[PDB]
Amino acid sequence: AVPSVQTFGKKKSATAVAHVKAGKGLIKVNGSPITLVEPEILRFKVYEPLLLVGLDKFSNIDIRVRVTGGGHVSQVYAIRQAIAKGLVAYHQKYVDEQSKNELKKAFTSYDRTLLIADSRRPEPK
Amino acid sequence: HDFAVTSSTRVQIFSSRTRQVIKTFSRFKDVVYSASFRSDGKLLCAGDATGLVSVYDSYNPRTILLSINASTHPTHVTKFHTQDNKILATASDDRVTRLWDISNAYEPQLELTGATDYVRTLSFIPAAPHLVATGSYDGLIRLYDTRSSGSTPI
Amino acid sequence: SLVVQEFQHILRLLNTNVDGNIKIVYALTTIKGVGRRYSNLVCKKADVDLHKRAGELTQEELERIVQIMQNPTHYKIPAWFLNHTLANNVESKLRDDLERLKKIRXXXXXXXX
Amino acid sequence: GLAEKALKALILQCEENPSLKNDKDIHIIINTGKKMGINRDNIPRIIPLTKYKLFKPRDLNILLITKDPSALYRETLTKDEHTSELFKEIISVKNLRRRFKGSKLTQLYKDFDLVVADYRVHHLLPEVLGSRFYHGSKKLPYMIRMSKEVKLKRQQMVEKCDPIYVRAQLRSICKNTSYIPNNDNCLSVRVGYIQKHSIPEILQNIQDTINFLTDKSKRPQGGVIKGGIISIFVKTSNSTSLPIYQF
Amino acid sequence: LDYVENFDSPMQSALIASSLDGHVKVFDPLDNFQVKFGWKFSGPVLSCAVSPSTAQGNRHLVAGLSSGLLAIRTKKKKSNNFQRM
RNA sequence: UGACGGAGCCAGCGAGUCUAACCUUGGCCGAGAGGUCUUGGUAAAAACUCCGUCGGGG
């Protein structure tokens, strides 16, 4: 079959399953494209790993994300994690890893939640 | 693609394509006299006969953005600056024109006086931003300077 | 330099004092017994403009609207847009109920006594 | 015969008896010898009244339950001016379940005097509209078509709503009365009203009702009572069943 | 009175004016402000306006009369193997 | 930080052959018990986004 790679994202009770395969440069979430994210103010939070990396690095990859659980804010944060993990897991497997290293550095210089999700764990004093 | 037409207490925005009523502005106590768009096209004036002028955003009757209280006389013409895009010039039946910066919508930046009777149309001049043409209702077409003290025509 | 033109203050329509500042599709809503959507029906039956104030719309046709109002049955207008001591006995007949129950029970006899 | 006399004493007492001061509907009930075999569904079959119209549809509160998208069902019937002054309020079935739930079905029963739904979602109704409506046949949900075109096998449903023809149905459904078929013999039809008309109007309403119900031809809407009617009993909703047509 | 410059026209600029006789008359400053064309409406006209120079579509003449009338006069405006064939 | 409708879509803990009203008007059948039908009265995901309509208490 075609090359593929699969990552996971996690906010409070919302999970994201993103599959990244070689293709025509199309971006899909739940069948719908990315220009139809319903919270409508957080739509720039899911374009956010797209525009930090430059749109040329998504021109030949495909992204298909399912999301279940959570609400609205927790769902959008799951999509931006799974896209950013899905891009950086494709590039560590079939593309240059120095490309992966510059892709990873461009995310952790911005924000750590795009790569791994900090579990907001309780603490007793 | 739009033009504003004034009426009894209702400035309605039309269309150039459909030539039909897009929106209506029905937030007026007395009759609205003038309605001039700015050169940016975002914000349109509405001079009201009750005394105070209201300027808000185009294509939005809901958000009354600004309501400057002029003198208690009715305001016949409220025009925006052509080269500048932040200063409103209004007239009144109080025989004075006022130049309001919309940052300070409570005190007039330059109370342009010296008119004889009933200034009802004024205009700007595209070369010089300091020069404001002002027309009264007895002849005597005033030409005013706002870089100067601005209380007597050149 | 003359122009030929064509307003008034508050008006009465069968003892209903209505202001002349808002348009008639919501001005008639202050009249008792009149619904909101009933006003949009009765205005278009009376051949007026819905976004138009009550200061205009002259009194010869203002009386024409209010006669549509007072006789709704004959102008083919449907009428479905339109509209104690029994608590005194029932508690007092349970007051003696709790009073005799305090008499019946040999414990409940110390309210304000 | 004595049907005029039976209606005379029923009309006289209903404005005089303190218990009967509130019931304004008149029912004839029919008990037959044999039991008609069709069990009680909840789709009311209506019958015509060929001479005297019962109600005109501009004096009844009419609730319509439509399909889930409900955009052009709402839009066309509100802005056609054939039905614009006819329908009281239009609700989609999913929004009716979500909004009106609990004790608010009681005020929906009291305020709105007649309920009608399309043939699409009428079977889904009794679990969202409540058991208060299905206590007899006062506000039993009636029937309307919506499109005046049929669906064959594997054909895509073409959506259409003609307001003139659905207005003519509500003209055809408020002008007369309806029967709901039952397993046992006793079925009741609401013929006439106390103050809409009078005794000779009710009398030929009785005659046209028993003519349609005993029609041996015209099977699927009319051939319900078989053999012969044993008796008929005129009543209000709280009165006694006064006897006529003994054999 | 309204004025438009450099719009797509056989002349460079046009100056229009409402006359309170139903007449809106156009003038051009290059031809010493002489009259070129005049439309006539029924009632007297209190407001006259034309579309600006950069409409890129149907241009409009909007004239407003005393009798509550807005007169609008408008100038309007296979297979992929066979392409590789 | 309103009202009125109309769309948009997001959850997790739940599932014992266990899940759940009362009063009344009658008709027919039955020796009764009651059964069947009739009738009327009484009680019983949100948020958010978006689209338009709207601008003192008895």
Short mmCIF file of N, CA and C in Angstrom, two decimals, chain D residues 23-168:
data_model
loop_
_atom_site.label_atom_id
_atom_site.label_comp_id
_atom_site.label_asym_id
_atom_site.label_seq_id
_atom_site.Cartn_x
_atom_site.Cartn_y
_atom_site.Cartn_z
N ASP D 23 -69.08 21.35 28.60
CA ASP D 23 -68.91 20.54 27.40
C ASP D 23 -69.73 21.12 26.26
N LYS D 24 -69.07 21.45 25.15
CA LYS D 24 -69.72 22.09 24.02
C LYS D 24 -69.78 21.21 22.78
N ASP D 25 -69.25 19.99 22.83
CA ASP D 25 -69.27 19.09 21.70
C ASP D 25 -70.38 18.06 21.85
N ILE D 26 -70.90 17.60 20.72
CA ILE D 26 -72.00 16.64 20.68
C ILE D 26 -71.51 15.39 19.96
N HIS D 27 -71.70 14.24 20.59
CA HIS D 27 -71.25 12.96 20.04
C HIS D 27 -72.43 12.02 19.86
N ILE D 28 -72.45 11.33 18.72
CA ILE D 28 -73.27 10.15 18.56
C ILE D 28 -72.34 8.95 18.64
N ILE D 29 -72.73 7.94 19.40
CA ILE D 29 -71.93 6.72 19.49
C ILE D 29 -72.71 5.62 18.79
N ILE D 30 -71.98 4.66 18.24
CA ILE D 30 -72.57 3.58 17.46
C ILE D 30 -72.12 2.26 18.06
N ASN D 31 -73.08 1.44 18.48
CA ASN D 31 -72.80 0.08 18.89
C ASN D 31 -73.42 -0.87 17.87
N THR D 32 -72.61 -1.77 17.34
CA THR D 32 -73.03 -2.71 16.32
C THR D 32 -73.11 -4.11 16.92
N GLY D 33 -73.71 -5.02 16.16
CA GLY D 33 -73.78 -6.40 16.59
C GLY D 33 -72.44 -7.09 16.49
N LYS D 34 -71.93 -7.23 15.27
CA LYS D 34 -70.60 -7.78 15.07
C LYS D 34 -69.54 -6.74 15.42
N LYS D 35 -68.35 -7.22 15.72
CA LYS D 35 -67.21 -6.36 15.99
C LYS D 35 -66.43 -6.15 14.70
N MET D 36 -66.20 -4.89 14.34
CA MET D 36 -65.36 -4.59 13.19
C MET D 36 -63.91 -4.91 13.51
N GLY D 37 -63.24 -5.60 12.58
CA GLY D 37 -62.02 -6.31 12.91
C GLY D 37 -60.78 -5.44 13.00
N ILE D 38 -60.82 -4.22 12.47
CA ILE D 38 -59.62 -3.40 12.43
C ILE D 38 -59.38 -2.79 13.81
N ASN D 39 -58.18 -3.02 14.35
CA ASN D 39 -57.84 -2.54 15.67
C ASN D 39 -57.60 -1.03 15.64
N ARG D 40 -57.46 -0.45 16.83
CA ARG D 40 -57.40 1.00 16.95
C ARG D 40 -55.98 1.46 16.65
N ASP D 41 -55.79 2.01 15.46
CA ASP D 41 -54.62 2.81 15.13
C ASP D 41 -54.87 4.25 15.61
N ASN D 42 -54.04 5.19 15.17
CA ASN D 42 -54.18 6.57 15.60
C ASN D 42 -54.24 7.54 14.42
N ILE D 43 -54.57 7.05 13.23
CA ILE D 43 -54.81 7.91 12.08
C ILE D 43 -56.32 8.07 11.92
N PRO D 44 -56.87 9.27 12.11
CA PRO D 44 -58.32 9.46 12.06
C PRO D 44 -58.82 9.56 10.62
N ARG D 45 -59.66 8.61 10.23
CA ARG D 45 -60.32 8.69 8.94
C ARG D 45 -61.45 9.70 9.02
N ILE D 46 -61.51 10.62 8.07
CA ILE D 46 -62.52 11.66 8.12
C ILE D 46 -63.62 11.32 7.14
N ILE D 47 -64.80 11.86 7.40
CA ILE D 47 -65.97 11.66 6.55
C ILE D 47 -66.48 13.04 6.16
N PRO D 48 -67.10 13.17 4.99
CA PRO D 48 -67.68 14.46 4.61
C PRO D 48 -69.09 14.65 5.15
N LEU D 49 -69.48 15.92 5.22
CA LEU D 49 -70.86 16.32 5.48
C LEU D 49 -71.34 17.10 4.27
N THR D 50 -72.25 16.51 3.51
CA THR D 50 -72.51 16.95 2.14
C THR D 50 -73.32 18.24 2.06
N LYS D 51 -74.06 18.59 3.11
CA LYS D 51 -74.91 19.77 3.06
C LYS D 51 -74.39 20.92 3.92
N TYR D 52 -74.15 20.66 5.20
CA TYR D 52 -73.82 21.69 6.19
C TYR D 52 -72.37 21.53 6.62
N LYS D 53 -71.60 22.60 6.47
CA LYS D 53 -70.23 22.63 6.96
C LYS D 53 -70.22 22.79 8.47
N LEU D 54 -69.31 22.07 9.13
CA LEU D 54 -69.26 22.16 10.59
C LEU D 54 -68.54 23.42 11.04
N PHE D 55 -67.23 23.48 10.80
CA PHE D 55 -66.38 24.60 11.20
C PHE D 55 -65.67 25.17 9.98
N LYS D 56 -65.57 26.49 9.92
CA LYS D 56 -64.64 27.00 8.92
C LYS D 56 -63.25 27.15 9.54
N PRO D 57 -62.16 26.96 8.78
CA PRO D 57 -60.84 26.81 9.42
C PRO D 57 -60.19 28.08 9.92
N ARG D 58 -60.93 29.19 10.01
CA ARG D 58 -60.40 30.43 10.56
C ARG D 58 -60.98 30.74 11.94
N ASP D 59 -61.37 29.71 12.69
CA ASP D 59 -61.77 29.89 14.08
C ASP D 59 -61.18 28.82 14.99
N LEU D 60 -60.21 28.05 14.51
CA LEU D 60 -59.58 26.98 15.27
C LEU D 60 -58.08 27.22 15.32
N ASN D 61 -57.48 26.98 16.48
CA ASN D 61 -56.03 27.03 16.59
C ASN D 61 -55.42 25.76 16.00
N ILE D 62 -54.56 25.92 15.01
CA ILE D 62 -54.05 24.81 14.21
C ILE D 62 -52.54 24.72 14.39
N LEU D 63 -52.08 23.60 14.93
CA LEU D 63 -50.66 23.31 15.05
C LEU D 63 -50.27 22.29 13.99
N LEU D 64 -49.20 22.58 13.26
CA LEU D 64 -48.67 21.67 12.26
C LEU D 64 -47.31 21.16 12.70
N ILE D 65 -47.14 19.84 12.66
CA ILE D 65 -45.86 19.19 12.89
C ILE D 65 -45.33 18.77 11.53
N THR D 66 -44.13 19.23 11.19
CA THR D 66 -43.55 18.96 9.88
C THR D 66 -42.27 18.15 10.03
N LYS D 67 -41.56 18.02 8.91
CA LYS D 67 -40.31 17.27 8.85
C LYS D 67 -39.20 18.02 9.59
N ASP D 68 -38.10 17.31 9.84
CA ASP D 68 -36.97 17.89 10.56
C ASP D 68 -36.29 19.10 9.90
N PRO D 69 -36.02 19.16 8.58
CA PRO D 69 -35.40 20.40 8.07
C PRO D 69 -36.31 21.62 8.13
N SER D 70 -37.58 21.48 7.71
CA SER D 70 -38.67 22.41 7.99
C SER D 70 -38.46 23.84 7.51
N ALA D 71 -37.53 24.06 6.58
CA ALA D 71 -37.27 25.41 6.12
C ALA D 71 -38.35 25.86 5.15
N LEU D 72 -38.47 25.15 4.03
CA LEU D 72 -39.46 25.52 3.02
C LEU D 72 -40.86 25.04 3.38
N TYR D 73 -40.98 24.12 4.33
CA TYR D 73 -42.30 23.86 4.90
C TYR D 73 -42.81 25.07 5.68
N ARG D 74 -41.92 25.72 6.43
CA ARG D 74 -42.29 26.93 7.15
C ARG D 74 -42.43 28.10 6.20
N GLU D 75 -41.51 28.22 5.23
CA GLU D 75 -41.41 29.43 4.43
C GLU D 75 -42.55 29.56 3.44
N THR D 76 -42.93 28.46 2.79
CA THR D 76 -43.92 28.54 1.72
C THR D 76 -45.33 28.76 2.27
N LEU D 77 -45.69 28.06 3.34
CA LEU D 77 -47.03 28.18 3.90
C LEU D 77 -47.24 29.47 4.69
N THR D 78 -46.16 30.16 5.07
CA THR D 78 -46.32 31.42 5.78
C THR D 78 -46.42 32.60 4.81
N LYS D 79 -45.77 32.50 3.65
CA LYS D 79 -45.70 33.58 2.68
C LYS D 79 -46.35 33.18 1.35
N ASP D 80 -47.54 32.59 1.42
CA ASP D 80 -48.31 32.31 0.21
C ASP D 80 -49.60 33.12 0.13
N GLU D 81 -50.12 33.59 1.26
CA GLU D 81 -51.37 34.32 1.47
C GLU D 81 -52.61 33.49 1.17
N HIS D 82 -52.47 32.21 0.83
CA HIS D 82 -53.59 31.28 0.91
C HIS D 82 -53.71 30.71 2.31
N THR D 83 -52.56 30.40 2.94
CA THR D 83 -52.51 29.84 4.28
C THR D 83 -51.84 30.75 5.29
N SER D 84 -51.56 32.00 4.94
CA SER D 84 -50.80 32.88 5.82
C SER D 84 -51.59 33.27 7.06
N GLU D 85 -52.90 33.44 6.92
CA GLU D 85 -53.78 33.72 8.05
C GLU D 85 -54.52 32.48 8.52
N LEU D 86 -53.95 31.30 8.29
CA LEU D 86 -54.61 30.04 8.61
C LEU D 86 -53.89 29.28 9.71
N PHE D 87 -52.61 28.98 9.53
CA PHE D 87 -51.85 28.19 10.49
C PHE D 87 -51.49 29.04 11.70
N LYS D 88 -51.60 28.46 12.89
CA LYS D 88 -51.22 29.20 14.08
C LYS D 88 -49.71 29.18 14.28
N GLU D 89 -49.11 27.99 14.30
CA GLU D 89 -47.68 27.87 14.52
C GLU D 89 -47.22 26.56 13.91
N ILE D 90 -46.03 26.57 13.33
CA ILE D 90 -45.45 25.41 12.65
C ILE D 90 -44.21 24.97 13.42
N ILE D 91 -44.14 23.69 13.75
CA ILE D 91 -43.02 23.17 14.52
C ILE D 91 -42.46 21.94 13.82
N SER D 92 -41.14 21.82 13.80
CA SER D 92 -40.50 20.58 13.38
C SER D 92 -40.57 19.57 14.52
N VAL D 93 -40.60 18.29 14.15
CA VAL D 93 -40.83 17.22 15.11
C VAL D 93 -39.66 17.09 16.09
N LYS D 94 -38.43 17.31 15.62
CA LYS D 94 -37.28 17.27 16.52
C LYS D 94 -37.28 18.46 17.47
N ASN D 95 -37.71 19.63 16.98
CA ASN D 95 -37.81 20.79 17.85
C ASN D 95 -39.01 20.70 18.79
N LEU D 96 -40.07 20.00 18.37
CA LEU D 96 -41.22 19.82 19.25
C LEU D 96 -40.88 18.92 20.43
N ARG D 97 -40.09 17.87 20.18
CA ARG D 97 -39.63 17.00 21.25
C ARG D 97 -38.69 17.73 22.20
N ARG D 98 -37.82 18.58 21.65
CA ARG D 98 -36.80 19.23 22.47
C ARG D 98 -37.37 20.38 23.29
N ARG D 99 -38.31 21.14 22.74
CA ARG D 99 -38.83 22.33 23.41
C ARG D 99 -39.97 21.98 24.37
N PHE D 100 -41.01 21.33 23.85
CA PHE D 100 -42.21 21.03 24.63
C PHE D 100 -42.07 19.64 25.24
N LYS D 101 -41.70 19.59 26.52
CA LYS D 101 -41.53 18.32 27.21
C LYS D 101 -41.88 18.51 28.68
N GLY D 102 -42.58 17.54 29.24
CA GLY D 102 -42.91 17.55 30.65
C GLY D 102 -44.37 17.94 30.88
N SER D 103 -44.58 18.96 31.70
CA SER D 103 -45.92 19.46 31.97
C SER D 103 -46.35 20.53 30.98
N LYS D 104 -45.50 20.89 30.03
CA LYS D 104 -45.86 21.87 29.02
C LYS D 104 -46.72 21.28 27.91
N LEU D 105 -46.88 19.96 27.85
CA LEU D 105 -47.81 19.38 26.90
C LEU D 105 -49.25 19.64 27.31
N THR D 106 -49.50 19.87 28.60
CA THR D 106 -50.84 20.18 29.07
C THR D 106 -51.29 21.55 28.57
N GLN D 107 -50.40 22.54 28.64
CA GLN D 107 -50.76 23.87 28.14
C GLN D 107 -50.78 23.88 26.62
N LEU D 108 -50.01 22.98 25.99
CA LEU D 108 -50.12 22.82 24.54
C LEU D 108 -51.44 22.18 24.16
N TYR D 109 -51.99 21.33 25.04
CA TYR D 109 -53.31 20.76 24.81
C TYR D 109 -54.40 21.81 24.98
N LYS D 110 -54.28 22.64 26.02
CA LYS D 110 -55.34 23.59 26.35
C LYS D 110 -55.38 24.76 25.39
N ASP D 111 -54.22 25.30 25.03
CA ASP D 111 -54.19 26.52 24.22
C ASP D 111 -54.57 26.25 22.78
N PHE D 112 -54.15 25.11 22.23
CA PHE D 112 -54.27 24.85 20.80
C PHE D 112 -55.40 23.85 20.61
N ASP D 113 -56.40 24.22 19.81
CA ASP D 113 -57.64 23.46 19.74
C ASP D 113 -57.63 22.35 18.69
N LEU D 114 -56.66 22.33 17.78
CA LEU D 114 -56.58 21.23 16.83
C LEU D 114 -55.14 21.03 16.41
N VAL D 115 -54.77 19.77 16.24
CA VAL D 115 -53.41 19.36 15.89
C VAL D 115 -53.48 18.51 14.62
N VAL D 116 -52.59 18.80 13.68
CA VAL D 116 -52.54 18.07 12.42
C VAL D 116 -51.07 17.92 12.05
N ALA D 117 -50.72 16.79 11.45
CA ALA D 117 -49.34 16.54 11.06
C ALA D 117 -49.33 15.89 9.68
N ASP D 118 -48.18 15.96 9.03
CA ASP D 118 -48.01 15.33 7.74
C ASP D 118 -47.94 13.81 7.89
N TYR D 119 -48.09 13.12 6.76
CA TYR D 119 -48.07 11.66 6.77
C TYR D 119 -46.67 11.09 6.98
N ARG D 120 -45.63 11.92 6.93
CA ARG D 120 -44.27 11.43 7.11
C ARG D 120 -44.00 11.04 8.55
N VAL D 121 -44.39 11.89 9.50
CA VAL D 121 -43.89 11.77 10.86
C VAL D 121 -45.05 11.62 11.84
N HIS D 122 -46.23 11.26 11.32
CA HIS D 122 -47.40 11.11 12.18
C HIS D 122 -47.29 9.88 13.07
N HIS D 123 -46.67 8.81 12.58
CA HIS D 123 -46.52 7.62 13.41
C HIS D 123 -45.52 7.81 14.54
N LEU D 124 -44.57 8.74 14.38
CA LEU D 124 -43.60 9.04 15.42
C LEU D 124 -44.18 9.94 16.51
N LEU D 125 -45.38 10.48 16.29
CA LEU D 125 -45.97 11.46 17.20
C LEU D 125 -46.29 11.01 18.63
N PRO D 126 -46.94 9.86 18.90
CA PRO D 126 -47.49 9.65 20.26
C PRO D 126 -46.47 9.49 21.38
N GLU D 127 -45.19 9.29 21.07
CA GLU D 127 -44.17 9.23 22.10
C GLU D 127 -43.49 10.57 22.35
N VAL D 128 -43.82 11.61 21.59
CA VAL D 128 -43.31 12.94 21.85
C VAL D 128 -44.40 13.95 22.19
N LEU D 129 -45.66 13.65 21.91
CA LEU D 129 -46.75 14.59 22.10
C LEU D 129 -47.60 14.26 23.32
N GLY D 130 -47.50 13.04 23.85
CA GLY D 130 -48.06 12.72 25.14
C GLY D 130 -49.34 11.91 25.07
N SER D 131 -49.64 11.26 26.19
CA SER D 131 -50.84 10.45 26.33
C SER D 131 -52.07 11.27 26.69
N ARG D 132 -51.90 12.56 26.98
CA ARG D 132 -53.05 13.42 27.27
C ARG D 132 -53.89 13.63 26.02
N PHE D 133 -53.25 13.72 24.86
CA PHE D 133 -53.97 13.88 23.61
C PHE D 133 -54.74 12.62 23.24
N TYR D 134 -54.20 11.45 23.55
CA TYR D 134 -54.83 10.19 23.19
C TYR D 134 -55.73 9.68 24.31
N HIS D 135 -56.59 10.56 24.81
CA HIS D 135 -57.68 10.21 25.72
C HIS D 135 -58.94 10.59 24.97
N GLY D 136 -59.40 9.69 24.12
CA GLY D 136 -60.47 10.04 23.22
C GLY D 136 -59.95 10.68 21.95
N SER D 137 -60.82 11.44 21.30
CA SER D 137 -60.52 12.02 19.99
C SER D 137 -60.93 13.48 19.95
N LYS D 138 -60.58 14.24 20.99
CA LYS D 138 -60.75 15.69 20.91
C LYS D 138 -59.62 16.33 20.13
N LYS D 139 -58.39 16.16 20.60
CA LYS D 139 -57.20 16.65 19.92
C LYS D 139 -56.36 15.48 19.41
N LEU D 140 -57.02 14.49 18.82
CA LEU D 140 -56.30 13.47 18.08
C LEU D 140 -55.65 14.12 16.87
N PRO D 141 -54.40 13.79 16.55
CA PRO D 141 -53.72 14.47 15.43
C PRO D 141 -54.27 14.03 14.09
N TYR D 142 -54.71 15.00 13.29
CA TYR D 142 -55.34 14.71 12.01
C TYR D 142 -54.27 14.49 10.94
N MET D 143 -54.70 14.45 9.68
CA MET D 143 -53.87 14.04 8.56
C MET D 143 -53.85 15.12 7.49
N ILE D 144 -52.66 15.44 6.98
CA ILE D 144 -52.53 16.21 5.75
C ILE D 144 -51.42 15.62 4.90
N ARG D 145 -51.62 15.67 3.59
CA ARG D 145 -50.52 15.50 2.65
C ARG D 145 -49.78 16.83 2.52
N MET D 146 -48.67 16.80 1.81
CA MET D 146 -47.86 18.00 1.69
C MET D 146 -47.46 18.33 0.27
N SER D 147 -47.37 17.34 -0.62
CA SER D 147 -46.71 17.54 -1.90
C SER D 147 -47.61 17.34 -3.12
N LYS D 148 -48.69 16.56 -2.97
CA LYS D 148 -49.56 16.12 -4.08
C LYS D 148 -48.76 15.42 -5.18
N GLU D 149 -47.82 14.57 -4.77
CA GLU D 149 -47.14 13.67 -5.68
C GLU D 149 -46.62 12.48 -4.88
N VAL D 150 -46.50 11.35 -5.55
CA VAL D 150 -46.30 10.08 -4.89
C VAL D 150 -44.84 9.66 -4.99
N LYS D 151 -44.48 8.62 -4.25
CA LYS D 151 -43.14 8.04 -4.30
C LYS D 151 -43.25 6.58 -4.68
N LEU D 152 -42.52 6.18 -5.71
CA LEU D 152 -42.48 4.79 -6.14
C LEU D 152 -41.29 4.09 -5.49
N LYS D 153 -41.04 2.85 -5.89
CA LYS D 153 -39.92 2.10 -5.34
C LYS D 153 -38.62 2.61 -5.94
N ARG D 154 -37.62 2.84 -5.08
CA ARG D 154 -36.27 3.31 -5.37
C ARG D 154 -36.21 4.72 -5.96
N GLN D 155 -37.33 5.43 -6.05
CA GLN D 155 -37.31 6.79 -6.55
C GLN D 155 -36.95 7.75 -5.44
N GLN D 156 -36.13 8.75 -5.78
CA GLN D 156 -35.76 9.78 -4.82
C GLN D 156 -36.97 10.64 -4.49
N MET D 157 -37.15 10.94 -3.21
CA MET D 157 -38.22 11.84 -2.79
C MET D 157 -37.92 13.25 -3.27
N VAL D 158 -38.78 13.78 -4.13
CA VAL D 158 -38.69 15.17 -4.58
C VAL D 158 -39.54 15.99 -3.62
N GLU D 159 -38.95 17.02 -3.02
CA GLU D 159 -39.63 17.76 -1.98
C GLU D 159 -40.38 18.93 -2.62
N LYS D 160 -41.67 19.03 -2.30
CA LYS D 160 -42.54 20.07 -2.82
C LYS D 160 -43.61 20.32 -1.78
N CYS D 161 -44.01 21.58 -1.63
CA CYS D 161 -45.11 21.94 -0.73
C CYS D 161 -46.02 22.94 -1.44
N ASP D 162 -47.19 22.47 -1.89
CA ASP D 162 -48.15 23.35 -2.54
C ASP D 162 -49.12 23.87 -1.49
N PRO D 163 -49.17 25.18 -1.23
CA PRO D 163 -50.01 25.67 -0.13
C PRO D 163 -51.49 25.68 -0.45
N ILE D 164 -51.87 25.81 -1.72
CA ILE D 164 -53.28 25.87 -2.10
C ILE D 164 -53.96 24.53 -1.82
N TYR D 165 -53.29 23.44 -2.17
CA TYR D 165 -53.91 22.12 -2.00
C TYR D 165 -53.89 21.67 -0.55
N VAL D 166 -52.92 22.14 0.25
CA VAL D 166 -52.98 21.77 1.66
C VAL D 166 -53.91 22.69 2.43
N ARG D 167 -54.19 23.88 1.89
CA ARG D 167 -55.24 24.71 2.45
C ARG D 167 -56.61 24.11 2.17
N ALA D 168 -56.77 23.53 0.99
CA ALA D 168 -58.03 22.89 0.63
C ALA D 168 -58.28 21.63 1.44
#
